[PDB]
Design a protein around this motif. Structure first.
Motif, PDB file in Angstrom:
ATOM      1  N   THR A  31      35.557  37.356  41.989  1.00  0.00           N
ATOM      2  CA  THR A  31      36.493  38.464  41.979  1.00  0.00           C
ATOM      3  C   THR A  31      37.671  38.267  41.034  1.00  0.00           C
ATOM      4  O   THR A  31      38.186  39.248  40.494  1.00  0.00           O
ATOM      5  CB  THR A  31      37.025  38.723  43.400  1.00  0.00           C
ATOM      6  OG1 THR A  31      37.714  37.559  43.875  1.00  0.00           O
ATOM      7  CG2 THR A  31      35.882  39.053  44.347  1.00  0.00           C
ATOM      8  N   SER A  32      38.096  37.039  40.791  1.00  0.00           N
ATOM      9  CA  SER A  32      39.237  36.811  39.933  1.00  0.00           C
ATOM     10  C   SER A  32      39.002  35.763  38.867  1.00  0.00           C
ATOM     11  O   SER A  32      39.960  35.367  38.212  1.00  0.00           O
ATOM     12  CB  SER A  32      40.428  36.405  40.778  1.00  0.00           C
ATOM     13  OG  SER A  32      40.172  35.211  41.465  1.00  0.00           O
ATOM     14  N   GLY A  33      37.786  35.286  38.692  1.00  0.00           N
ATOM     15  CA  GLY A  33      37.507  34.349  37.630  1.00  0.00           C
ATOM     16  C   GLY A  33      38.194  33.026  37.818  1.00  0.00           C
ATOM     17  O   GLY A  33      37.955  32.345  38.810  1.00  0.00           O
ATOM     18  N   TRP A  34      39.041  32.633  36.868  1.00  0.00           N
ATOM     19  CA  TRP A  34      39.745  31.365  36.948  1.00  0.00           C
ATOM     20  C   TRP A  34      41.236  31.521  37.165  1.00  0.00           C
ATOM     21  O   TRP A  34      41.964  30.536  37.052  1.00  0.00           O
ATOM     22  CB  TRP A  34      39.505  30.559  35.670  1.00  0.00           C
ATOM     23  CG  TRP A  34      39.864  31.301  34.418  1.00  0.00           C
ATOM     24  CD1 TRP A  34      41.095  31.369  33.837  1.00  0.00           C
ATOM     25  CD2 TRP A  34      38.981  32.087  33.583  1.00  0.00           C
ATOM     26  NE1 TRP A  34      41.039  32.142  32.702  1.00  0.00           N
ATOM     27  CE2 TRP A  34      39.753  32.587  32.531  1.00  0.00           C
ATOM     28  CE3 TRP A  34      37.617  32.400  33.641  1.00  0.00           C
ATOM     29  CZ2 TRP A  34      39.210  33.391  31.540  1.00  0.00           C
ATOM     30  CZ3 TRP A  34      37.074  33.204  32.648  1.00  0.00           C
ATOM     31  CH2 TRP A  34      37.849  33.686  31.623  1.00  0.00           C
ATOM     32  N   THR A  35      41.716  32.715  37.462  1.00  0.00           N
ATOM     33  CA  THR A  35      43.147  32.909  37.562  1.00  0.00           C
ATOM     34  C   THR A  35      43.722  32.358  38.853  1.00  0.00           C
ATOM     35  O   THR A  35      44.882  31.949  38.867  1.00  0.00           O
ATOM     36  CB  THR A  35      43.501  34.403  37.442  1.00  0.00           C
ATOM     37  OG1 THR A  35      42.855  35.135  38.493  1.00  0.00           O
ATOM     38  CG2 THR A  35      43.054  34.953  36.097  1.00  0.00           C
TER      39      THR A  35
END
Ligand SMILES: *[C@@H]1O[C@H](CO)[C@@H](O[C@@H]2O[C@H](CO)[C@@H](O)[C@H](O)[C@H]2NC(C)=O)[C@H](O)[C@H]1NC(C)=O
Lengths: 49, 22
Positions: free
Chosen positions: A3-7
């Motif tokens: 849902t948010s990748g690597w953030t």
């Protein structure tokens, strides 16, 4: 990750659509991002198999 | 062309040369 990748590992989780997440990941390896956007169905079907 | 990508939106893209040039 989905849902948010690597953030979320560096701070707050920032949502972004997954198809756009995959396009950034191709950009990180030196592939121009239209390769995903014009072939989204092909990459998703090939991945699933 | 803008008929293969899914999710495209319609908007105006501004060219700075066209107005000033013309
Ligand atoms: C984005 O703009 C294009 C071009 O104006 C739109 O395509 C037209 O869509 C209408 C129906 O909404 C059709 O009657 C026309 O024949 C289409 N024109 C062409 C050249 O195909 C397109 O629908 C717009 N997209 C959105 C989401 O409004």
């Amino acid at each position: 990750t989905i849902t948010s990748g690597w953030t979320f590992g560096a701070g707050p989780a920032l949502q972004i659509p997954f198809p756009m997440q995959m396009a950034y990941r191709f950009n990180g390896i030196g592939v121009t991002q239209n390769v995903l956007y014009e072939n989204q169905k092909l990459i998703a079907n090939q991945f699933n198999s | 062309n803008c008929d293969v990508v899914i999710g495209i939106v319609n908007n105006t893209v501004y060219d700075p040369l066209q107005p000033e040039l013309d």
